[PDB]
Symmetry: C4
Subunit: 180 residues, 4 copies
């Protein structure tokens, strides 16, 4: 992992089930609320702040997801498309990174093809076994409970940038880039 982690320059995360606990909160009008986790966002920022682009590939789309994407300043992303293989390379071309430079975090079958495309994949804790068996690393955290952060934390760990989340001083350093 140390191997591939240090080489990551681009992170692609699914949304529902990863940045989310997979719950689709409906009201009479369809998707009404989507729950993201505050620690994941800080992690997204810490990555970006540490020269590591972050994009979301979601087999779904909603103004809610878009808003969250905008709050976080994510620039690269693909929504509504359930085929993830070509979508990743398309994100990779856009980021000027190779497969070997992009990590991916998923939770379901829909992500099986993105794990094949990115070379460095993550599975959230509550992911089913066929997904766990198809990734490089299984997270201890459940989707939506900080799984992404667990990943960002370890990517920034291996690349010697942990000080940003490790300590009061390292954090106050990148303080002007932690918002969401």
């Amino acid at each position: 992992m140390q191997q591939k982690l240090e080489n990551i320059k681009f992170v692609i995360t699914d949304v529902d089930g990863v940045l989310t606990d997979g719950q689709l909160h409906y009201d009479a009008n369809g998707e009404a609320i989507k729950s993201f986790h505050v620690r994941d966002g800080l992690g997204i920022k810490m990555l970006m702040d540490a020269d590591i682009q972050v994009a979301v590939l979601s087999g779904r789309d909603s103004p809610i997801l878009r808003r969250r994407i905008a709050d976080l300043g994510i620039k690269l992303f693909f929504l509504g498309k359930l085929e993830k293989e070509t979508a990743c390379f398309d994100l990779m071309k856009q980021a000027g990174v190779t497969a070997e430079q992009t990590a991916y975090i998923g939770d379901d079958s829909v992500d099986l093809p993105a794990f094949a495309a990115c070379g460095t994949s993550f599975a959230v804790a509550d992911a089913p076994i066929y997904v766990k068996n198809a990734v490089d690393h299984v997270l201890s955290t459940h989707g939506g409970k900080g799984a992404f952060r667990e990943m960002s934390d370890m990517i920034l760990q291996a690349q010697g940038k942990s000080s940003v989340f490790d300590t009061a001083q390292g954090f106050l350093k990148s303080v002007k880039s932690m918002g969401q």
Copy 2:
């Protein structure tokens, strides 16, 4: 039970307690939010995509639920039904199948007569003791945490159709009917 699982051409699921964790999110106007798990949605489609029909039979009726049912493309169902036996038999007839080819996943006492009516019956992990004792298989996933997907996975697996969720290759092939 692989036998039962292989005969299943029809699944009837309860809503509150199975497709959700049993929480009813009230507004001053009654249910204002119903949470559904994306991974359960995917599983419902895969069953459908696999020639296995799906029906909903809730003890409660809400437009929120009716919207979720429509999103999933489920045509057979009954809502607000606390008497589930008759409901189960009607649904079977509508699906053109026998009690022998249909499964039912429930969580509480209301589901007891549905159990008796359906060939195969499942209970979510958090179901009371008297519901667990009356089904063929108690699932390990709690209501609302993807217990339906745990079941649909068993069903497809047992009918040699797991490649749909087992792998990149298989999932892609049915990428056409994997929506929510």
Copy 3:
């Protein structure tokens, strides 16, 4: 407990913390959502159906709660008052029962007075120890996860009325009265 239980004719429950997980869902305007558990609802209906009245006591009054109280068909209740002692006596006089015939289920310091006024008291699994200390029976289910159902099943069982919930036929006989 078996003796106290078979004598119960009246149940008074707190709300936030018992019928809910103590979570208060805020939007910019205060409580925006109250989550109640379905199996608790069936519990309340099963209790009333077995000639055991159910009242609700909460320090918080909100149209959301009132809506729930109405769906359940709960007749006696005191809202907005954090001084539960007199409230308990008033409800008991209204219910026409003695303190020895009434059960109270709580979760916080606020409920201590209630425990003392009511013959029988229950605490939800996640109540703090100084609450579990003050009651007759500490339940094993968390507040809002069906602790109330745990208690009602317990009262119904103790009264030779567990049938409505442990048998399809028992349930089907009291079905016209299970609507929440």
Copy 4:
């Protein structure tokens, strides 16, 4: 802690991850819902009632949070502030107390500088190990599950004021200052 606890005359609490479980429930417009635990709510009031001021320092700012704040009667706070060191000192000045007289409860990296600035610091149970390593005391309750209340009880206890949450009498005596 004992010595620390007895001198606490001011508690500063983070919001996301402490008063809540870190989930950010998004609308197409940003945070749509914020869930706060009722017992944390009461713990805040018991603190104030015992002449211990309570302040809030949060990385995010929202009208939902401000509403909770006003309901709890909190006057000192700084929102949207990711730099918490200065803020803690400023709040300390506002409360007329010293770093020694002030406790802080947090859950993530952003809180690191807050822990260092306050005499006594707490971490919620689900905080990252790198946050736990940095606090005076790690609570056993997860953020949003009543971790603030667990701390408030410790403080009051240490000061010989547990009677408010300890007994019916102590509660009633202060019952007029328990609303949230």
